[PDB]
Point group: C3
Chain length 450, copies 3
């Protein structure tokens, strides 16, 4: 009989906490916003047991999976309301020919540079290397951004050719991935060469890249609206514009439409519908959240009209224009996971651009029972070994125990006219009651081939 | 040169032990019947190594898999003998266009109620809730049955729509499952609501549900022929009739034809053929087993004629009539496993009806090497941790040992004119020979990514 | 700026070490040959990280996989050079319609017998049993060979029908395997019957079978050119001829074209091209390696002309003629692995010919997330158990520690006018600083279902 919302801790939550009050005293219903880590992973797990938030906030790309796993309820926006929001963002939230989430805003990474250290930014990726040179001599760097999430480097990977799944005739092809073609390699190798050439680090993430640009330690960065807020507060004269090109090709970023979905396990299913339909998705609702952390190109037509006239937003849309709309299909988590590994491995040097990118593709396929078996049998040789080790420790323990007991025996004899050892020290007596049941249980332990 | 049969401990084994004697002294060949737990799982494992019984008894549904795994021999019933048994039960035991087992009897769950506590039983599922109310007030309950095996609750899941695989044009479609559609959810949610509303328990199984109906603690129950025996012995006036309806739809139970198969690793392959063809599948053979535990609608035409005129049997057939014939395809074990998990999870509340039922479906598909890899790598982070723990224990052990040795040192000095410690206590000396080889082996331990 | 080659330790490496010198002083570039165990497995792993050899030597069958994993560079043999080598061996090294390795020689197992113990060899498999009888009476055996690698017994498995993948219309069909058909079983059962009948052992490998034939302990053996060298040195009058027939059918051996590939991670990519194109693949290059360990039917036309006139080579080609060319497709490692398991299991009796051969086939398919899950959950019940065991050991350790400390306490009291225990023994004091951090870490340990 309440209402709980979940949003990314990197978005305008306190701003949503406000619209969360408008609902409370104007409806009485207590709204509560939460922002946990690994949100996209947590929800599906807690939601699966009937727990979790009534409303979930995340990009549309991973909703199809939550829907496939049957975790949310189909929303029912009255044919009228559907015309308050842009049609293209409605599709982004329509899975299996049905609506599964309320689009909130359109996001697209952009190129943020500090006009005070770089009045004129680079129009090409190819020149950042030599540009970083000049700045490194001055103490700072040229470009810094999160290298932990494929989301950021992907725009470069797609630039010269890379692509998730081919959208063949209004239908994405799962057997048609393109994470390991020419364009792909090209992009990744360049990015890596950047780290290889000390222009970039790899242990670098979000808080690391964010704190650096904001401290003026770097001239460039790649992010989305939500960031702008913290830069303003940092009094650094920044500028938002189109992303650099690669091999003459514009960086193709993956665009996502942040959405609000309704936990199928939710009892307050209408409370939500009305909170989003009549409280959030309003010009004054989108605004409160925006004052907290820029949403970008909101879906509400009325609000986008006086938001689109802003350069930071115009550039975000040009970027999304240059990019592609993320797919819905449940095969995203995999895809994304595949690319996270490639990028991290290739960058960390644990893999090669050619090797990493290949794995990504080939691995998107089914593993034989054989491997599962081999895997199985393998872990056995393993577990078994831990056992004997454990088992052995027990015995030795015992050998030590008896040894101790014996010594203690001689003591009691020395302190006999005292009452043995414990009585002569006038202290609580100790006791070697030693027993390890699991020791045996682990020996019986049937084979894992069952 | 002998002969061994395996049957479920819940069926008429001692009755088969008798026909097992008719074979012995009338052929000399010693027959032996066994009934182990997890029979359907055990056989494939022991049979795989050439061990196990010459003859196996279980429902036809899982024989295709034993045949696929190449565990049984094709039977050779002479075109004449095939007309002693009902044609429809012959199909149930024909895989890949070949015969793999001898059908014994047709089984179909029914509704058993105690006429003395409920003269008139419920014709609908929807009324058991309120009916359980009246009885709970009297001390007993309304319905109780095994909730550990999908077999029992399935009739409800299929009732309003659920289905294993769609039989498209004389061919079952593996890509066409129906464990997560409307009818499915409907049924499961109701069943769960029954437990949710304290009308039913979930930790409840066979022996629990069987002992309750037989003790008169409950008015209803769902089972098959084999059960009737123990009720008779319990002097409870029971009645067997059609299963209740759900949403106006009759509970569709999965019918199985208990069969006898021949271990391909069997040397006494003809001994079997003749034991089943000329000793078991005879009116007097089926009868002996029947006196032990009701087989149901046997396959032997002659015996079914004077068995079908029995209400308990008429109702069993009406039930099977209302239901569907179980598929042969090796993809049953999976399917069944999928539903066992759904039902147990949904009931125990560990999952939701919508979440559980979905898993069942989506999981019937292939997992990426990625997951296998992720899984792999994951278990590593794990195993490794156990190591260091183990490893650490060893060291501490040693620290303790030396500590002990030292103390012992001072003792020998106190009891020096005695011969040290051991000599003064005049007892076998203890010894700290401490060594854990596996400790190192576990350190070397290559990564699991190989 | 160097150059490293990897070849099997069972081939002519020192011979290649020589041609490795011709390159050095005639180019200055230092060449180094290595021969590690599990080469085919090692390379893909080290090559994946950018390490490993610039050139890899192994049969063509597993190159497609290295290419699929993107581990080698496409070679560029000038249209002219391609006519120095036999066209059929060029195909063997062409994957995805591109060249990935330089063919070196064509290999095909043969039948080696000691003319001095068996002037006339068996033309059929069926007679070795009774022939082994006569010889066993004389102290020796009839046939001995490596039973650890499917490569050797495969010629028998394919003889009467077995086959990897069906080559349908210039295209191998992955869904069309034939490791579990009639011919297959036939062959395997016979082979096994050979061991079952004490004519053959199963713990038998290469060094075991090689040392026996060379010591004159056996009259026959199955191997390839590389072997001949060691027999010559052993002064045993051997003979190389066609393989025995099975059920009237000639043993169909799998032929491989030993090839040299170029690590895609290689900086000396041209150094290689020139080492193989102008130094190795020359009549004098092939020769140096040949003096070390027979290559067989080399690919260099000029050298094959005066090599083919040799009986050992004529017979090798007749054998390959009777056999089939190994496929390129990455699905070989699996296939091979599948057959290694079948043969070892069937032979060791851990499985039956019918059961083992089936697994091989059915397992070449995808495993459900279910199994992965079941597997997962299963390992949990496992890991968890090891924990509590470990955990328990810790506690007991502690109980022992305190016990020890206490005893020590009484000692210090006995040796008080000495300075306690440590001071009376005038030795470094011991210390029970006991702490197992992982103990807790392992308790927190989230479930593996994440
Ligand atoms: O990097 C993989 C990740 O990419 C996208 O997530 C973005 C999200 O859309 C943005 O709104 C912002 O919060 O940052 C995320 C990356 O940190 C996908 O939407 C997401 O599913 C995927 O895992
Ligand atoms: O619950 C899954 C289970 O269902 C069927 O097994 C029945 C069997 O047919 C009956 O004869 C009786 O013994 O009880 C079983 C359930 O306990 C399937 O035949 C079986 O394969 C499946 O696992
Ligand atoms: O037994 C499986 C194994 O077979 C073939 O390997 C042969 C190789 O071709 C020969 O040149 C020689 O070295 O011995 C090997 C078997 O020990 C396949 O080429 C190989 O991939 C496969 O694993
Ligand atoms: Cl002690
Ligand atoms: Cl331990």
């Amino acid at each position: 009989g309440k209402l709980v919302i979940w949003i990314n801790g990197d978005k305008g939550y306190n701003g949503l906490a406000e619209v969360g009050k408008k609902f409370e005293k104007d409806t009485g219903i207590k709204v509560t916003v939460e922002h946990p880590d690994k949100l996209e992973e947590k929800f599906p797990q807690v939601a699966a047991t009937g727990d979790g938030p009534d409303i979930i906030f995340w990009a549309h790309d991973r909703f199809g999976g939550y829907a496939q796993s049957g975790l949310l309820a189909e929303i029912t926006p009255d044919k009228a309301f559907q015309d308050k929001l842009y049609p293209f963002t409605w599709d982004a939230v329509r899975y299996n020919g049905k609506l599964i989430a309320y689009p909130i805003a359109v996001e697209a990474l952009s190129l943020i540079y500090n006009k005070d250290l770089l009045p004129n930014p680079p129009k090409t990726w190819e020149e950042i290397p030599a540009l970083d040179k000049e700045l490194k001599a001055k103490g700072k760097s040229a470009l810094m951004f999160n290298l932990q999430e494929p989301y950021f480097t992907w725009p470069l990977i797609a630039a010269d050719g890379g692509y998730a799944f081919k959208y063949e005739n209004g239908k994405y092809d799962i057997k048609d991935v393109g994470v390991d073609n020419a364009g792909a390699k090209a992009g990744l190798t360049f990015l890596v060469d950047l780290i290889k050439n000390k222009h970039m680090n790899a242990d670098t993430d979000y808080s690391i890249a964010e704190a650096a640009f904001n401290k003026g330690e770097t001239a460039m960065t790649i992010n989305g609206p939500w960031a702008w807020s913290n830069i303003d507060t940092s009094k650094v004269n920044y500028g938002v514009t189109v992303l650099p090109t690669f091999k003459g090709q514009p960086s193709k970023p993956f665009v996502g439409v942040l959405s609000a979905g309704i936990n199928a396990a939710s009892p307050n299913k209408e409370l939500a519908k009305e909170f989003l339909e009549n409280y959030l998705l309003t010009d004054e609702g989108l605004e409160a959240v925006n004052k907290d952390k820029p949403l970008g190109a909101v879906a509400l037509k009325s609000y986008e009209e006086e938001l689109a006239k802003d350069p930071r937003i115009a550039a975000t849309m040009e970027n999304a224009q240059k990019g592609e709309i993320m797919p819905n299909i449940p095969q995203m988590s995999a895809f994304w996971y595949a690319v996270r590994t490639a990028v991290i491995n290739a960058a960390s040097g644990r893999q090669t651009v050619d090797a990493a990118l290949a794995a990504a593709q080939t691995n998107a396929a089914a593993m034989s029972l054989a491997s599962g078996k081999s895997l199985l049998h393998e872990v056995d040789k393993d577990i078994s070994q831990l056992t004997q080790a454990i088992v052995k420790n027990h015995k030795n323990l015992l050998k030590i125990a008896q040894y101790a007991a014996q010594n203690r025996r001689g003591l009691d004899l020395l302190f006999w006219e005292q009452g043995g050892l414990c009585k002569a020290l006038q202290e609580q007596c100790c006791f070697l009651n030693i027993t390890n049941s699991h020791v045996s249980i682990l020996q019986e332990r049937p084979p894992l081939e069952n």
